[PDB]
Design a binder for these strands. Sequence first.
RNA 1: ACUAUGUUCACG
RNA 2: GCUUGAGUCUCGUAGAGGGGGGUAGAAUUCCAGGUGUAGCGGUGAAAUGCGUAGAGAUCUGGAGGAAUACCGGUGGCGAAGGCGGCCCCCUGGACGAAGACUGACGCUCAGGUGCGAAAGCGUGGGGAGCAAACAGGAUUAGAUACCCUGGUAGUCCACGCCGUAAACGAUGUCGACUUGGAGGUUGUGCCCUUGAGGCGUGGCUUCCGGAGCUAACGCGUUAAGUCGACCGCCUGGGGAGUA
Lengths: 271, 65, 129, 88, 65, 100
Amino acid sequence: AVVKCKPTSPGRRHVVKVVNPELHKGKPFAPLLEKNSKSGGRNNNGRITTRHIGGGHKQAYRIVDFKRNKDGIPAVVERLEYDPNRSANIALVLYKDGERRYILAPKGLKAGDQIQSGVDAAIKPGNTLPMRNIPVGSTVHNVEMKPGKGGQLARSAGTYVQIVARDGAYVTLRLRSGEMRKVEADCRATLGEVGNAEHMLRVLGKAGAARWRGVRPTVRGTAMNPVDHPHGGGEGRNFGKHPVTPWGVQTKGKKTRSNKRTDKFIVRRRS
Amino acid sequence: FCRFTAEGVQEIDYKDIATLKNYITESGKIVPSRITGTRAKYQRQLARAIKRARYLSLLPYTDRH
Amino acid sequence: SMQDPIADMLTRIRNGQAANKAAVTMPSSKLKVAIANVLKEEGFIEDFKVEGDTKPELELTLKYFQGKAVVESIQRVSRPGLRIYKRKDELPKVMAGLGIAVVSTSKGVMTDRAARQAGLGGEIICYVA
Amino acid sequence: SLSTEATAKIVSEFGRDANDTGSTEVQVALLTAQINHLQGHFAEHKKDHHSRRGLLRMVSQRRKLLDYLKRKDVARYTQLIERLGLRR
Amino acid sequence: IKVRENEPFDVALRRFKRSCEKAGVLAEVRRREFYEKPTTERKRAKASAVKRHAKKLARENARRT
Amino acid sequence: MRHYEIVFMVHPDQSEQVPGMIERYTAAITGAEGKIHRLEDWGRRQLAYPINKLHKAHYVLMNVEAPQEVIDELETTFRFNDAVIRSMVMRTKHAVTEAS
RNA sequence: ACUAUGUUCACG
RNA sequence: GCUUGAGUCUCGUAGAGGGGGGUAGAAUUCCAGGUGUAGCGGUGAAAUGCGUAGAGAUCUGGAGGAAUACCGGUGGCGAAGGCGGCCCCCUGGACGAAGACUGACGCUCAGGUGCGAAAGCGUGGGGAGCAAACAGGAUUAGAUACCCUGGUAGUCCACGCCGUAAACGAUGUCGACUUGGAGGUUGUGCCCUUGAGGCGUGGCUUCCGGAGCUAACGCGUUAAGUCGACCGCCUGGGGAGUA
Ligand SMILES: [Mg+2]
Ligand SMILES: [Mg+2]
Ligand SMILES: [Mg+2]
Ligand SMILES: [Mg+2]
Ligand SMILES: [Mg+2]
Ligand SMILES: [Mg+2]
Ligand SMILES: [Mg+2]
Ligand SMILES: [Mg+2]
Ligand SMILES: [Mg+2]
Ligand SMILES: [Mg+2]
Ligand SMILES: [Mg+2]
Ligand SMILES: [Mg+2]
Ligand SMILES: [Mg+2]
Ligand SMILES: [Mg+2]
Ligand SMILES: [Mg+2]
Ligand SMILES: [Mg+2]
Ligand SMILES: [Mg+2]
Ligand SMILES: [Mg+2]
Ligand SMILES: [Mg+2]
Ligand SMILES: [Mg+2]
Ligand SMILES: [Mg+2]
Ligand SMILES: [Mg+2]
Ligand SMILES: [Mg+2]
Ligand SMILES: [Mg+2]
Ligand SMILES: [Mg+2]
Ligand SMILES: [Mg+2]
Ligand SMILES: [Mg+2]
Ligand SMILES: [Mg+2]
Ligand SMILES: [Mg+2]
Ligand SMILES: [Mg+2]
Ligand SMILES: [Mg+2]
Ligand SMILES: [Mg+2]
Ligand SMILES: [Mg+2]
Ligand SMILES: [Mg+2]
Ligand SMILES: [Mg+2]
Ligand SMILES: [Mg+2]
Ligand SMILES: [Mg+2]
Ligand SMILES: [Mg+2]
Ligand SMILES: [Mg+2]
Ligand SMILES: [Mg+2]
Ligand SMILES: [Mg+2]
Ligand SMILES: [Mg+2]
Ligand SMILES: [Mg+2]
Ligand SMILES: [Mg+2]
Ligand SMILES: [Mg+2]
Ligand SMILES: [Mg+2]
Ligand SMILES: [Mg+2]
Ligand SMILES: [Mg+2]
Ligand SMILES: [Mg+2]
Ligand SMILES: [Mg+2]
Ligand SMILES: [Mg+2]
Ligand SMILES: [Mg+2]
Ligand SMILES: [Mg+2]
Ligand SMILES: [Mg+2]
Ligand SMILES: [Mg+2]
Ligand SMILES: [Mg+2]
Ligand SMILES: [Mg+2]
Ligand SMILES: [Mg+2]
Ligand SMILES: [Mg+2]
Ligand SMILES: [Mg+2]
Ligand SMILES: [Mg+2]
Ligand SMILES: [Mg+2]
Ligand SMILES: [Mg+2]
Ligand SMILES: [Mg+2]
Ligand SMILES: [Mg+2]
Ligand SMILES: [Mg+2]
Ligand SMILES: [Mg+2]
Ligand SMILES: [Mg+2]
Ligand SMILES: [Mg+2]
Ligand SMILES: [Mg+2]
Ligand SMILES: [Mg+2]
Ligand SMILES: [Mg+2]
Ligand SMILES: [Mg+2]
Ligand SMILES: [Mg+2]
Ligand SMILES: [Mg+2]
Ligand SMILES: [Mg+2]
Ligand SMILES: [Mg+2]
Ligand SMILES: [Mg+2]
Ligand SMILES: [Mg+2]
Ligand SMILES: [Mg+2]
Ligand SMILES: [Mg+2]
Ligand SMILES: [Mg+2]
Ligand SMILES: [Mg+2]
Ligand SMILES: [Mg+2]
Ligand SMILES: [Mg+2]
Ligand SMILES: [Mg+2]
Ligand SMILES: [Mg+2]
Ligand SMILES: [Mg+2]
Ligand SMILES: [Mg+2]
Ligand SMILES: [Mg+2]
Ligand SMILES: [Mg+2]
Ligand SMILES: [Mg+2]
Ligand SMILES: [Mg+2]
Ligand SMILES: [Mg+2]
Ligand SMILES: [Mg+2]
Ligand SMILES: [Mg+2]
Ligand SMILES: [Mg+2]
Ligand SMILES: [Mg+2]
Ligand SMILES: [Mg+2]
Ligand SMILES: [Mg+2]
Ligand SMILES: [Mg+2]
Ligand SMILES: [Mg+2]
Ligand SMILES: [Mg+2]
Ligand SMILES: [Mg+2]
Ligand SMILES: [Mg+2]
Ligand SMILES: [Mg+2]
Ligand SMILES: [Mg+2]
Ligand SMILES: [Mg+2]
Ligand SMILES: [Mg+2]
Ligand SMILES: [Mg+2]
Ligand SMILES: [Mg+2]
Ligand SMILES: [Mg+2]
Ligand SMILES: [Mg+2]
Ligand SMILES: [Mg+2]
Ligand SMILES: [Mg+2]
Ligand SMILES: [Mg+2]
Ligand SMILES: [Mg+2]
Ligand SMILES: [Mg+2]
Ligand SMILES: [Mg+2]
Ligand SMILES: [Mg+2]
Ligand SMILES: [Mg+2]
């Protein structure tokens, strides 16, 4: 459920929690975990390339399986786990042979359900297939952009691609943006919708909730001096210049798409 | 004229279209009761059977297809 | 939903007389036979019976003198919503003593005229003009 | 909906025989049987307000029979509730 | 609707159209018929019908015509 | 438990498969208590209008008694199958015979 | 197609 | 104690009763392309608007969303609000048939609870058409309108809130009783189905009328007639269903 917290303190007042009752309460499966040290937004050169990131809670990386390499092998969903490295939840899948892997939990899924993947299989939520084999006009997620790769598109909580059309070797997909992209039919896609759709109704409530998610404070250009940001200076709340990034490029309606290579695949741009 | 027959009763079925095509006009529309007789009960069974026959493309919805 | 059976009897009589009807069937009772006989004894009704064993149906036979009916008017006084018990001296006289008021007294059901002389009052059931 | 076998099972157990099927003991059990079947229906659906009016008829109807049965006889009233699981 | 009229004829004669649709497509689904207004304007077309039909029985008056 | 009347239509080129299709749909139902009362393969009958831009669909009428689990499993095998162009599943009112 | 207004009390 | 009230059981019939999930066809809109050559659009009459960048018209393929032509009626169902393509899933009631059972278990109901059109409101979607606001063009003495071209909230779905309408038969709920006629609709029994018959007895329902009632209009076995039970409400108009 989406439970609103009672106003016992200012900072608590506005908090809205997404309390999933079906998640596991305990330590995760270690073999799939590994360390994930933080950058703080800095790179090779030790310089802030991405602003406003740094701090937060320490969090380990779960090796989630996007490829779904196991063909013609059934797999029982053992337990749904919380993932700090992701918007969506994950499911500890135990394959019939012996292996265990983490996968993104679709919407219709619980501890006990069985999933199969490969070439044949059945058309059901969670069952990964080649997009050729999937019926046209169906809800998919964890969609590959290249055959044999992991899975790029629709991985966030409540996110899903819809297969619009199927032109021979190619499949026209309508993405969550509204962009209609043409991908290869040999590429795979996990059926259904990505779970944890309540995620968006979470509201943090306090400053520190953003700080313990690893975000840092965003200072407005207008607040700065002219030397710092193009917006800057003025003796008491001035502006009078067109909105811009700290590096002068115009924000607020200014197309930065310039790939050129992959412009053939885009059937129609978003709107 | 009226219904099926004197000792008919029966039920208006969608599968048969020979006797059923009499009750629709040339355009494809269902003909009303005030033109073809029929009790209100059998007109409703008919109207349903036309719509089921239309789903299976046994009868047409119209004549602009 | 059928709270007063006695009022219902007196409507069937009243409406039967309006319709110019000969006989008036209804479900019987102890108090129904007592009132019906008092109406008969003075002379509003011309004979009655109580035909039935398991489910008795008391049918009256209404009286007519001219084209006009005999029972000019008949109404419930001591209805169940408001019971009306009158004292010996306070007993009414319907139409200045040429119509009767059926009164349930301690010595059985009787008319208002007989109640005065007998020396007792009671529940005044219905005025009959 | 209550099938033929479901009613006939309750009728030939609480009452005297399959012949007897109108007792307050029987009547209340048939309502309790349907009311408990309808809980699974109103678990989801929820917006089915028209069927709820048919249920709340059955509920109130059952209370009128039990309140009758209590005033009529305290012995068989208390014994019926222990078996059906009412009172709550 | 699909009217050929053999070969020597021409002169339109397509009452098939005029006694089937036209009024249904046009003076009905042209502008907004406010849900309630049909229930009003039908029930007055319906009340006006039996008004005439009941009068037609009592139309045989003296006349002297 | 319940009687039904399945009337599905199949694509022309896959009408050779229909003999095979019927044997699988019979085997699903005939095992679970209720028997099929009357089959009747209609044949490659003309369409009143073009469905999916084609004419002549291969009609098949089963008419069968089954529980709700088996019939809804058969209902899903029509949607997840490109060969079958449409179908409908009617209700009870006893078994029947003849009529076309 | 659009197309406004007629001061107050009275006389019957 | 009893059985006619009330309720249960059997068996069928009808129905846009309800909730959830599918899918069908016509159309509209936009999207891409073919054809094609000046208009189209609209109106009382015009103009704003779209069009030589090739529109309109016409064709082909696609995406969407919402609504279900004809059947469809003084037809049906629902307590009221209300409810219409077709199909399954679960589901409430209604009516009839002849029995068996229970044995007055009933009728009303202040407080109280539940549902309750449309418009609103919150949150997340969705958005073709339509369309408050808004803009432009006409109209006009003026035109914050009516008419025209655009067009956002809304209208659609999931989950809550709102709690009102000329929520109207302007007619409280239950029961008894009192001449008729013409229909519709759904039953069920008896003879010959001896040919789309008839002859009966139940529900729901539209219209016209008798006595009676009514200020009159009208109502009239579904009373506003004749009575009973209980509830709600009324007490001149404005102030005011306001403070
Ligand atoms: Mg490790
Ligand atoms: Mg890194
Ligand atoms: Mg380095
Ligand atoms: Mg270095
Ligand atoms: Mg940056
Ligand atoms: Mg940032
Ligand atoms: Mg992070
Ligand atoms: Mg910020
Ligand atoms: Mg800031
Ligand atoms: Mg900022
Ligand atoms: Mg500052
Ligand atoms: Mg400063
Ligand atoms: Mg700097
Ligand atoms: Mg600068
Ligand atoms: Mg300064
Ligand atoms: Mg300064
Ligand atoms: Mg400053
Ligand atoms: Mg200043
Ligand atoms: Mg300035
Ligand atoms: Mg700059
Ligand atoms: Mg006696
Ligand atoms: Mg007896
Ligand atoms: Mg006796
Ligand atoms: Mg308790
Ligand atoms: Mg409890
Ligand atoms: Mg208790
Ligand atoms: Mg408890
Ligand atoms: Mg209406
Ligand atoms: Mg003036
Ligand atoms: Mg007895
Ligand atoms: Mg009885
Ligand atoms: Mg009864
Ligand atoms: Mg029953
Ligand atoms: Mg039944
Ligand atoms: Mg039915
Ligand atoms: Mg039926
Ligand atoms: Mg229905
Ligand atoms: Mg329905
Ligand atoms: Mg429904
Ligand atoms: Mg829904
Ligand atoms: Mg529905
Ligand atoms: Mg279509
Ligand atoms: Mg558009
Ligand atoms: Mg073109
Ligand atoms: Mg050209
Ligand atoms: Mg001009
Ligand atoms: Mg011009
Ligand atoms: Mg031009
Ligand atoms: Mg050109
Ligand atoms: Mg064009
Ligand atoms: Mg065009
Ligand atoms: Mg769109
Ligand atoms: Mg109606
Ligand atoms: Mg009704
Ligand atoms: Mg009703
Ligand atoms: Mg319908
Ligand atoms: Mg629909
Ligand atoms: Mg049901
Ligand atoms: Mg019922
Ligand atoms: Mg008995
Ligand atoms: Mg007894
Ligand atoms: Mg007995
Ligand atoms: Mg009060
Ligand atoms: Mg109240
Ligand atoms: Mg409410
Ligand atoms: Mg609304
Ligand atoms: Mg809203
Ligand atoms: Mg707001
Ligand atoms: Mg909210
Ligand atoms: Mg949105
Ligand atoms: Mg919104
Ligand atoms: Mg939006
Ligand atoms: Mg829009
Ligand atoms: Mg949108
Ligand atoms: Mg418009
Ligand atoms: Mg307008
Ligand atoms: Mg506004
Ligand atoms: Mg303006
Ligand atoms: Mg003027
Ligand atoms: Mg001027
Ligand atoms: Mg002007
Ligand atoms: Mg203006
Ligand atoms: Mg204007
Ligand atoms: Mg607002
Ligand atoms: Mg819906
Ligand atoms: Mg909604
Ligand atoms: Mg509320
Ligand atoms: Mg009100
Ligand atoms: Mg209304
Ligand atoms: Mg009305
Ligand atoms: Mg009414
Ligand atoms: Mg009122
Ligand atoms: Mg009322
Ligand atoms: Mg009430
Ligand atoms: Mg009540
Ligand atoms: Mg009455
Ligand atoms: Mg009669
Ligand atoms: Mg009659
Ligand atoms: Mg009749
Ligand atoms: Mg009648
Ligand atoms: Mg006859
Ligand atoms: Mg009747
Ligand atoms: Mg009427
Ligand atoms: Mg009336
Ligand atoms: Mg009238
Ligand atoms: Mg009348
Ligand atoms: Mg009558
Ligand atoms: Mg009569
Ligand atoms: Mg009548
Ligand atoms: Mg009668
Ligand atoms: Mg009657
Ligand atoms: Mg009545
Ligand atoms: Mg009647
Ligand atoms: Mg009355
Ligand atoms: Mg009056
Ligand atoms: Mg009051
Ligand atoms: Mg008051
Ligand atoms: Mg006053
Ligand atoms: Mg008040
Ligand atoms: Mg108000
Ligand atoms: Mg107020």
